[PDB]
Design a protein around this ligand. Structure first.
Ligand SMILES: [Zn+2]
Ligand SMILES: [Zn+2]
Lengths: 209, 240, 179, 302, 116, 399, 48
DNA sequence: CCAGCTCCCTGCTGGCTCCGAGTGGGTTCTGCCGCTCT
RNA sequence: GAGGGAACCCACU
DNA sequence: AGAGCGGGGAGCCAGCAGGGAGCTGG
C-alpha cells in the first residue's frame, strides 16, 4: 500500500535527519521536524506510482565546521543491493568527490556487497543501514543514554587524567547500533553520560574495538 | 542481659490455650468456610451448566481455577482475620508475632482457623488417579475438599485426605530446598570467579586484574555501601 | 528426598504368581482367543490382558469381572494377590499376577454395607482359641488386597460413617472401605 | 503472564541466554491509542501473529473439473458469477475468528496472491466464509495442493509479527508501569494507560510499529536488547532485570553491587556471560581461568 | 464430510486418488496392481480445524457401570424416563476449554447419553 | 521373607530349568542337563571338615556368612559313533552356597518359639528379613522400576518425536533381561505424521508398516485390521495414511525382513543371513512376552497393532497420556527378583566355565570329571560379593 | 617396540604396537577421552 | 545471449564440560587363579 | 610421641 | 612336591552439508 510505505519513507528520512544532525552535519531545523503532510507535499503520496521515488530521496549534507566535508544518503530502489549498485553509487561519489555515504537498503546486501564495502572503506566510507533498523531513532529510547563522540584532544586529555592506556578503557563494538548510528571507527572514544541512582550523573568512556 | 533477666520475673510461654479460639469465633469460621464452599459449588454449577464466561487471556479451566482459588483465598483470609481479631492481649502467639520474634499471622490463622489450600506446582492437588485426587472421591470432583483445601486448623486436626494433601504440599517445600541448594551454590561460585579480582584502586577507580577500568568510581559515587542510608529528597515530589 | 520411600503399615508387595490357572479359567469362561476371532469382533468387545499379554476378547465384561472378583474373594483359582482392573471407558480388562505390585487390604463394601459383621469381630477376639485369623478373614470375602492400578477403579469410604449417609450422600456406590 | 522470577531468571540473566524461558515485551502506546480500549485492541491485533490456521474452520480438497458445475453445489452461484486445474481447495473460515481479528476476506485473498505470485488463482465470497484455490498451470497436482495447503496453514502470516505468539492487553493498577507525568501544577501524576505484554521478542518490528511508544517499549530479553539498542542500553536493561529479580521478594541489595555486576558483564563491549565461556575468554591469566573451570584445557591452551 | 481409506478388492491395498483427463473424472486407483474404480465421492480430503465439538459419539454406555462416577436423580433420561444418570466431564484433550457435563442413563438396555 | 521364599522355592529352580543344556563335540558328543535342585539348612564346615548346624549368632560373632549349600542333580549323556547313549546320574552336586535370609523358611530360626530363640541368644522381637554376610547384617532395599509388559504413551519434550509408545517387554515365568520397543510418531516440524518403530538391537528407525509386513501381513487391509478395530473412524485412518505412504515401497515379506536386517548391530553380508537375523530379532527379541516360539506371529502382530492403536489414541487426544510417576505403573524388585537376576547371571557364568573346561578335556583328552568341572566359587563369591558390597552385578564391572 | 624395530619385524605389528604406545601415553595424560576403552587397574577400576 | 561456476551464508548435530559448602560414621576392596618346572 | 588408599552406603547442618 | 612368579540434563563451540550471488568465460 502506498500510504503505509510513504509513512515508512517519511520516518526513515526523519531518522536520517536526526542522525546527520547528531553527527554534526548541517541539517536545518525545518527538515528535522518535517511532518508527514510536508513530506507528502514535497515528495508525493504513491511510491508504487513513483511520485516519491527512492532515488529522488537521496540526501546530501555538509559538516558544520568543514563545508567540504559532505556525506551522501542513498536509498536504493531494488530490495537487495549487489556489486553494480555500489559501483554506480561510488562512481557518483567520485564525480562529486565525496568520501562518505550511507546506504539505506530495504532487505539487505549480499555478502560480496559488504565485502566490497570493506575493501573500498580506506578511500570511501560506506555505511549500510537497513530500513527496519532506521524506522526508529534508537538514541531516543529510554535505555540508550547520551553518547558524545570525543575529539582526539579530549581523548588524550582523558588518558592523561586517568593515566590510562587505550585498552584499559571499557570497550564498545564498531558494529554496535549506537556506534553505527554515530558512524564511529576503531580507536575513537565515546563519552557516555547517564543518570545514576547513587551519584545523579555518571560519565563512562568506551573505546571502539 | 537486662531483658533476659527481666524475663525471669515476667516469664514467657506458649500453650494449647493460646491456640484456642472463642466459641463465637469457631462459629464465625465455620460459617465462613460453609459459605465459601457453597460459593465454590455455585461456580462449579455455573461451569457445568456452561454459564461460565471466560476472561481475556485465559481458557475455561484457567478462569474456573482462578475464580475458585479467589474464593478459597478469600475464605482463608477472612477466617484468618477472624482468628486474629479473636486473640486476647494475653495470647502468646500474638505476643511472638507482634514482636516479630517468631511466626506470622498466617501461622496463627493455620493453627487457629484454617490450614488452607494445599498446592502442588502452583496449582491445586492434581488428578493423580483417573480424574480423582484420591480414590475416596468421585470422578471429576473439582470441589475444595477433593482438590486439597484443608478446612480444618492444626488444633482441630486434619482429616486423612487433608493430611495426605498437606503432606503433598510440604514435600514440595522439602524438594525446593534440596534442589535449590546446588544451583544457588553454582551461581555464587560463578559470580565470585567472575569478579574476584575487581577492586578499588588507589586512584579510586574500580579495576580488574588486567588493570582495565570497570568503574571510574565505586558505585558511580565512590562511596562504601556500609555507611549510606535511606533518605528523602525534599524537592522532588512537591508541586511548584 | 522423595527418592527413598518407606512402606505403609499394611502395605504388602505382591510376591508373584503364575498366569496359567487364570488363563485356563478364562478360556472356559466365554473368552475368545485372538487366533480364532475375526478382527471385526474386536471393536465392540473388551480386550483381555493377562500380565500385559493380550490373550483374547470378551463380550460381557461386567459379568466376567463379577465372576473374577467372586473367585478371588473365596481364594479360588485366582489367588488374593492377583490384580484385576476394568478400564470401562477404554474397554479393557487387565489381570496382573506378577511380582512387585504393591497392594493393601481393604474392607469390601456391598450395597452400602460392610461385609465385616459382628460375627467376624467376635471370632477375631479369640485368635488363640478359635484358630480364627486374618487369613480366615480374607477367605470369608470380607477383606481383599487392592493394588494401586486396581485402586484407581475402586470407590473408597474412609470410614463406615460414609456408608451410612443422607442428604447429598456424595456416593452410594462404595466398593471398598478403609480398615 | 507466566514470567520467570527468582533463581531460574537470575540464571538466565548472568548466563547470557539466547533462549529465555518466557521472553516478553512491554509495549507502551502513544496518545489516544493508549487511552481508549478499542484502538489499543487495534494495536494488539496488528501485533498478534495470525496464520490462516487461526481463522480457518475447515479446509477441504475437491475434484471439480468443471467449475460451471461445482461438485459442492453450495458455491454454485458466485462461481458462475465469476465464470485451470481440476483440483479445488475450498477454505471455510470460522466466523468468530474472522471477526475478532478485524479481517475482511479480500485482505486474505490478496495475501495469497502476493505470497504465491499469482501462480495459483483465488476466488472468494462471503455473506459461510468461503475461499477457493486453484493452480494455474510426476509430482501430481493434488500433492502440490496438499503442500501449498500446509504452507497456507502453517507458514503464512496474515497480520502481526511472527515471533510474537500471544499478546495480553492490560491496564496497570500500580505505578510501576503507569505513565508518570509532570503536570502544569508541578506534581507527579500517575496516568493509567493501556500497556501490552507479549510472549515473544521481535522488539525492532514492534518499536517501528504504528502508535507504539519508541522510547519506553522494552523487552526482558538481554541478547535482543543488546542487538537492537547497544551495550549501554543492555547495561541498563540488565540492571533493571537484576533489580526486578532481587526485589520481587521485597529484599533490597545496594545499587553498587548490581552496578558492578552489570559493568563486569558489559565492560568489553559484548555481553560477557557469567560462565566459563565468558569469564575464561577474557585477558585474565591462565591460573585464574584454570582455577575457575576447564583447568587442563586452559593449561594446555596456555 | 470425512473420507475413509478405500481398498482394492484384489490385493487389499489402499486406493490412491487419481484423475483421468479424457473422461476428466476422479478415479481411485490401486498402485500395487493396475486396478481402478469410479469414486463415489468427489471429496479427497477435508481438514476439520474446529469440528472437535462432537464428543457424544465417543461415549459408550458402559460408563453407567462405573462405581466411581457421580450419579444424579435430577436429570431424567429423555429416551426412557429413568431418573438416575451418571455424569462426567469429557475425558479428551479438547476438555481444556470445556467443563461440559455429559450424562449417561444408568438403566440397563437403554444406555442413552446426552448433554444438559 | 515372602520374596526370598519365592526366590528359593521357585526362582532358582526355574533358572536351572531355563538353562539350555550343554552340547559339546570334538567326534564324541556330550550332553549335560541340570534337573533338580536341593537346598540344605545353613551349615558350617570348619578346617576339620565336619558339617555343623550354624547359628546366626555364630555367623555374627565369627564373621561367617549365613549361607546354605545348593545341590543340583546332573545327568550326563555320552553319544559315541556306533554306540548307544551313556546315562550317568550325579546326584546332589554342590554348586555354590546361597545366603539365607534370617527367619525365612530355610533359616534355622524358622518356626521356633520365643523360648527356643532365647535359648539360641536370639531376640524374638527381631524381625529377620536380612542376611548375614561376613558377620555383617545386610538388608536388600527394594528397588523401583517401570512396570514391564505394559504399553505406556508419553510425549518426549524438545524431541523430533511428538508421541512415543513404550513397552519394556519381559518374558513372564522366566528370568530374562527386558527388551524395549518404541512405537512412536514424528513431530509436525513432512506432508504427514508417520508412525515409526524403534526395535531392539536395530541401530536405525524402521517404519511400522514394514514391520507389519515383516511378521507376514502384506495386505494393507490385513495390517489395518490389526491397527484399527472399527473402520468407521476416519481420523485414525487419516493418521495411519502417512505410514502407508512412507512404507508403500516395500510390498512383500522378504524384502521387509531385508529392510529390517539392513541396519542391525552387524549387517549380514548374505541376504539369507540377513533374513535369518531379522527372524531372530522379530521372534526372539521383539515383544518376548506375547510369544517366543515359532508360528506365534498373530499374537505379536495384534499386540504391536494395539501399541500403534494406543499411540494413535493419544495422538487424537482420545486417551490420556500415561504418567511415569503413577505408582501402578511401577514394580518393586524385592530380594527375590534381585537375587534371581544375580543367580541367573552367575549360573550362566558357571555353565560357561563348565562348558569351557569340558571342551578343554575333550579337545585333547577323552573324558572329564564333572566335580572338577563346577567352580562353586562363581555362585558363592558372586552372591557374597554383591550382598557384601551392594554393587549389584559383577565384580569387574562394579563401576 | 624397541625389540621389534631392533630386529626384523612386520609393518602391521609395528603399527599395532605404536597404537598401543599411543593409547598408553594418552591414557596417562587423560583417561576419559571418548571412543576408546578406559585404562583400567587389574582389579577392574579405571586408572586415575 | 545464457549456461557454466566459486565462495561466503544458515542449519543440523555430535562433542564436551558443568552440575552447593562442610562434617561424622560404617563396610568392602585392593592383592588371584591356572600353572611349568623339579 | 606416629604408617595406606580407593569405591560405596548411611547420616548431620 | 612344592614355592615364587608371570600375568542424568542444559547449554555452548565447532564442522559439516546445502544455498545463491557472480566474476570469468562465449
Ligand atoms: Zn490392487
Ligand atoms: Zn435411559
Amino acid at each position: 500500500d502506498d500510504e503505509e510505505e510513504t509513512y515508512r519513507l517519511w520516518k526513515i528520512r526523519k531518522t536520517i535527519m536526526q542522525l546527520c544532525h547528531d553527527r554534526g552535519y548541517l541539517v536545518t531545523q525545518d527538515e528535522l521536524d518535517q511532518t508527514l503532510e510536508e513530506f507528502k507535499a514535497q515528495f508525493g503520496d504513491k511510491p508504487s506510482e513513483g511520485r516519491p521515488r527512492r532515488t529522488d530521496l537521496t540526501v546530501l549534507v555538509a559538516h558544520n565546521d568543514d563545508p567540504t566535508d559532505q556525506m551522501f544518503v542513498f536509498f536504493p530502489e531494488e530490495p537487495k543491493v549487489g556489486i553494480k549498485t555500489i559501483k554506480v553509487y561510488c562512481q557518483r561519489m567520485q564525480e562529486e568527490n565525496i568520501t562518505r555515504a550511507l546506504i539505506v537498503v530495504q532487505q539487505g546486501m549480499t555478502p560480496s556487497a559488504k565485502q566490497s564495502l570493506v575493501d573500498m572503506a580506506p578511500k570511501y566510507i560506506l555505511e549500510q543501514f537497513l530500513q527496519q533498523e532506521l524506522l526508529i531513532n534508537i538514541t531516543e529510547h529510554e535505555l540508550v543514554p547520551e553518547h558524545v563522540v570525543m575529539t582526539k584532544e579530549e581523548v588524550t586529555e582523558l588518558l592523561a587524567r586517568y593515566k590510562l592506556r587505550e585498552n584499559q578503557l571499557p570497550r564498545i563494538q564498531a558494529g554496535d547500533p549506537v556506534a553505527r548510528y554515530f558512524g564511529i571507527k576503531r580507536g575513537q572514544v565515546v563519552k557516555i553520560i547517564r543518570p545514576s541512582e547513587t551519584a545523579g550523573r555518571y560519565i563512562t568512556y568506551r573505546l571502539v574495538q | 542481659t537486662v531483658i533476659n533477666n527481666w524475663l525471669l520475673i515476667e516469664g514467657h510461654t506458649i500453650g494449647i490455650g493460646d491456640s484456642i479460639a472463642d466459641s463465637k469465633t469457631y462459629q464465625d469460621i465455620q460459617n465462613t468456610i460453609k459459605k465459601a464452599k457453597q460459593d465454590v459449588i455455585e461456580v462449579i454449577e455455573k461451569a457445568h451448566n456452561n454459564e461460565l464466561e471466560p476472561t481475556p487471556g485465559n481458557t475455561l479451566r484457567q478462569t474456573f481455577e482462578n475464580q475458585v482459588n479467589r474464593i478459597l483465598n478469600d475464605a482463608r483470609d477472612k477466617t484468618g482475620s477472624s482468628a486474629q481479631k479473636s486473640l486476647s492481649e494475653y495470647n502468646n502467639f500474638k505476643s511472638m508475632v507482634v514482636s516479630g520474634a517468631k511466626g506470622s499471622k498466617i501461622n496463627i490463622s493455620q493453627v487457629i482457623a484454617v490450614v488452607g489450600q494445599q498446592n502442588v506446582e502452583g496449582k491445586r492437588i492434581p488428578f493423580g488417579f483417573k480424574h480423582r485426587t484420591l480414590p475416596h472421591f468421585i470422578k471429576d470432583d473439582y470441589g475444595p475438599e477433593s482438590r486439597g483445601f484443608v478446612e480444618n486448623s492444626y488444633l482441630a486436626g486434619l482429616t486423612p485426605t487433608e493430611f495426605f494433601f498437606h503432606a503433598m504440599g510440604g514435600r514440595e517445600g522439602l524438594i525446593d530446598t534440596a534442589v535449590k541448594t546446588a544451583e544457588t551454590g553454582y551461581i555464587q561460585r560463578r559470580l565470585i570467579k567472575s569478579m574476584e579480582s575487581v577492586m578499588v584502586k588507589y586512584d579510586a577507580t574500580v579495576r580488574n586484574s588486567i588493570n582495565q577500568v570497570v568503574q571510574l568510581r565505586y558505585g558511580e559515587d565512590g562511596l562504601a555501601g556500609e555507611s549510606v542510608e535511606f533518605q528523602n529528597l525534599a524537592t522532588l515530589k512537591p508541586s511548584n | 528426598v522423595g527418592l527413598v520411600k518407606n512402606l505403609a503399615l499394611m502395605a504388602y508387595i505382591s510376591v508373584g504368581s503364575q498366569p496359567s490357572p487364570i488363563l485356563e479359567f478364562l478360556e472356559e469362561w466365554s473368552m475368545e482367543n485372538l487366533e480364532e476371532i475375526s478382527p471385526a469382533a474386536i471393536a465392540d468387545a473388551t480386550k483381555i490382558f493377562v500380565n500385559g499379554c493380550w490373550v483374547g476378547i470378551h463380550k460381557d465384561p461386567e459379568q466376567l469381572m463379577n465372576t473374577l472378583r467372586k473367585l478371588r474373594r473365596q481364594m479360588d483359582i485366582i489367588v488374593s494377590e492377583v490384580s484385576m482392573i476394568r478400564d470401562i471407558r477404554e474397554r479393557e480388562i487387565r489381570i496382573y499376577t506378577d511380582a512387585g505390585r504393591i497392594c493393601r487390604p481393604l474392607l469390601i463394601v456391598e450395597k452400602q454395607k460392610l461385609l465385616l459383621k459382628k460375627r467376624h469381630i467376635d471370632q477375631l477376639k479369640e485368635r488363640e482359641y478359635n484358630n480364627y485369623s486374618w487369613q480366615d478373614l480374607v477367605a470369608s470375602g470380607v477383606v481383599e488386597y487392592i493394588d494401586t492400578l486396581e485402586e484407581e477403579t475402586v470407590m473408597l469410604a474412609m470410614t463406615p460413617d460414609d456408608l451410612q449417609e443422607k442428604e447429598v450422600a456424595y456416593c452410594s456406590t462404595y466398593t471398598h472401605c478403609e480398615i | 503472564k507466566n514470567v520467570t522470577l527468582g533463581v531460574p531468571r537470575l540464571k538466565e540473566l548472568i548466563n547470557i541466554s539466547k533462549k529465555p524461558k518466557t521472553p516478553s515485551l512491554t509495549v507502551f502506546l502513544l496518545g489516544q491509542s493508549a487511552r481508549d480500549a478499542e484502538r489499543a485492541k487495534d494495536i494488539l491485533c496488528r501485533l498478534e501473529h495470525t496464520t490462516l490456521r487461526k481463522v480457518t474452520a475447515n479446509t477441504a480438497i475437491y475434484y471439480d473439473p468443471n467449475p460451471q458445475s461445482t461438485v459442492v453445489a453450495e458455491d454454485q452461484e458466485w462461481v458462475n458469477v465469476y465464470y485451470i486445474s481440476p483440483w479445488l481447495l475450498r477454505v471455510e473460515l470460522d466466523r468468530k475468528h474472522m471477526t475478532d481479528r478485524k479481517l475482511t476476506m479480500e485482505q486474505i485473498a490478496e495475501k495469497i496472491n502476493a505470497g504465491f505470485g499469482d501462480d495459483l488463482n483465488c476466488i472468494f465470497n462471503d455473506d459461510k466464509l468461503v475461499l477457493r484455490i486453484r493452480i494455474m498451470n510426476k509430482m501430481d497436482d493434488d500433492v502440490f495442493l496438499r503442500c501449498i495447503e500446509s504452507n497456507m496453514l502453517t507458514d503464512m502470516t496474515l497480520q502481526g509479527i511472527e515471533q510474537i505468539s500471544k499478546v495480553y492487553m492490560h491496564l496497570p493498577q500500580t505505578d510501576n508501569k503507569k505513565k508518570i507525568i509532570i503536570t502544569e501544577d508541578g506534581e507527579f501524576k500517575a496516568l493509567q494507560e493501556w500497556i501490552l505484554e507479549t510472549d515473544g521478542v521481535s522488539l525492532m518490528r514492534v518499536l517501528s510499529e504504528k502508535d507504539v511508544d519508541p522510547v519506553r517499549t522494552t523487552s526482558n530479553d538481554i541478547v535482543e536488547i543488546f542487538t537492537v539498542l547497544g551495550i549501554e542500553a543492555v547495561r541498563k536493561a540488565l540492571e533493571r532485570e537484576l533489580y526486578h529479580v532481587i526485589s520481587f521478594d521485597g529484599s533490597y541489595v545496594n545499587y553498587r553491587h548490581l552496578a558492578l555486576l552489570c559493568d563486569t558483564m558489559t565492560c568489553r563491549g559484548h555481553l560477557m556471560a557469567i560462565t566459563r565461556h565468558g569469564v575464561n575468554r577474557q585477558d585474565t591469566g591462565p591460573l585464574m581461568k584454570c582455577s575457575f573451570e576447564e583447568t587442563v584445557d586452559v593449561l594446555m591452551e596456555a | 464430510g470425512f473420507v475413509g481409506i478405500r481398498f482394492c478388492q484384489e490385493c487389499n491395498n489402499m486406493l490412491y486418488p487419481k484423475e483421468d483427463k479424457e473422461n476428466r473424472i476422479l478415479l481411485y486407483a490401486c498402485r500395487n496392481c493396475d486396478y481402478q474404480q469410479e469414486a463415489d465421492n468427489s471429496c479427497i480430503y477435508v481438514n476439520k480445524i474446529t469440528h472437535e465439538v462432537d464428543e457424544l459419539t465417543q461415549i459408550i454406555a458402559d460408563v453407567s457401570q462405573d462405581p466411581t462416577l457421580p450419579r444424579t436423580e435430577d436429570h431424567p433420561c429423555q429416551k426412557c424416563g429413568h431418573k438416575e444418570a451418571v455424569f462426567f466431564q469429557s475425558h479428551s484433550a479438547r476438555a481444556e476449554d470445556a467443563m461440559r457435563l455429559y450424562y449417561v442413563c444408568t438403566a440397563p438396555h437403554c444406555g442413552h447419553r446426552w448433554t444438559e | 521373607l515372602d520374596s526370598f521364599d519365592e526366590f528359593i522355592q521357585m526362582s532358582v529352580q526355574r533358572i536351572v530349568e531355563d538353562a539350555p543344556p550343554i552340547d559339546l563335540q570334538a567326534p564324541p558328543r556330550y550332553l549335560l542337563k541340570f534337573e533338580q535342585i536341593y537346598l540344605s539348612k545353613p551349615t558350617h564346615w570348619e578346617r576339620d571338615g565336619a558339617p555343623s548346624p550354624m547359628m546366626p549368632n555364630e555367623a555374627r560373632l565369627r564373621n561367617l556368612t549365613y549361607s546354605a549349600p545348593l545341590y543340583v542333580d546332573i545327568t550326563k549323556t555320552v553319544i559315541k559313533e556306533g554306540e548307544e547313549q551313556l546315562q550317568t546320574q550325579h546326584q546332589k552336586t554342590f554348586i555354590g552356597k546361597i545366603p539365607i535370609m534370617l527367619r525365612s523358611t530355610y533359616c534355622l530360626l524358622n518356626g521356633l518359639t520365643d523360648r527356643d530363640l532365647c535359648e539360641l541368644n536370639e531376640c524374638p522381637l527381631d524381625p529377620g528379613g536380612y542376611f548375614i554376610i561376613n558377620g555383617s547384617e545386610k538388608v536388600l532395599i527394594a528397588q523401583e522400576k517401570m512396570a514391564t509388559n505394559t504399553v505406556y504413551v508419553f510425549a518426549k519434550k524438545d524431541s523430533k518425536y511428538a508421541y512415543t509408545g513404550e513397552c519394556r517387554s519381559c518374558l513372564e515365568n522366566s528370568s530374562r533381561p527386558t527388551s524395549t520397543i518404541w512405537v512412536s510418531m514424528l513431530a509436525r516440524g513432512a506432508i504427514g505424521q508417520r508412525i515409526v518403530a524403534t526395535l531392539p538391537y536395530i541401530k536405525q528407525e524402521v517404519p511400522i508398516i514394514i514391520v507389519f509386513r515383516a511378521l507376514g501381513f502384506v495386505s494393507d487391509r490385513d495390517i489395518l485390521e490389526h491397527i484399527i478395530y472399527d473402520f468407521e473412524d476416519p481420523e485414525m485412518m487419516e493418521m495411519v495414511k502417512p505410514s502407508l505412504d512412507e512404507a508403500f515401497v516395500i510390498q512383500e515379506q522378504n524384502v521387509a525382513l531385508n529392510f529390517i536386517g539392513s541396519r542391525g548391530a552387524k549387517p549380514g553380508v548374505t541376504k539369507e543371513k540377513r533374513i535369518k537375523y531379522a527372524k531372530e530379532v522379530l521372534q526372539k527379541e521383539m515383544l518376548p512376552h506375547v510369544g517366543v516360539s515359532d508360528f506365534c506371529e498373530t499374537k505379536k502382530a495384534y499386540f504391536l497393532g494395539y501399541m500403534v492403536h494406543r499411540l494413535l489414541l493419544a495422538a487424537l487426544g482420545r486417551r490420556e497420556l500415561d504418567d511415569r510417576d503413577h505408582y501402578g505403573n511401577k514394580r518393586l524388585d524385592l530380594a527375590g527378583p534381585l537375587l534371581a537376576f544375580l543367580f541367573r547371571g552367575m549360573f550362566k557364568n558357571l555353565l560357561k566355565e563348565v562348558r569351557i573346561y569340558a571342551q578343554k578335556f575333550i579337545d585333547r583328552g577323552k573324558d572329564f570329571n564333572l566335580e572338577l568341572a563346577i567352580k562353586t566359587r562363581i555362585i558363592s563369591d558372586g552372591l557374597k560379593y554383591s550382598l557384601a558390597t551392594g554393587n549389584w552385578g559383577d565384580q569387574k564391572k562394579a563401576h | 617396540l624397541r625389540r621389534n624395530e631392533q630386529n626384523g619385524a612386520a609393518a602391521h605389528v609395528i603399527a599395532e604396537d605404536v597404537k598401543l604406545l599411543q593409547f598408553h601415553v594418552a591414557t596417562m595424560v587423560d583417561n576419559e577421552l571418548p571412543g576408546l576403552p578406559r585404562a583400567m587397574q587389574k582389579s577392574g577400576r579405571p586408572l586415575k
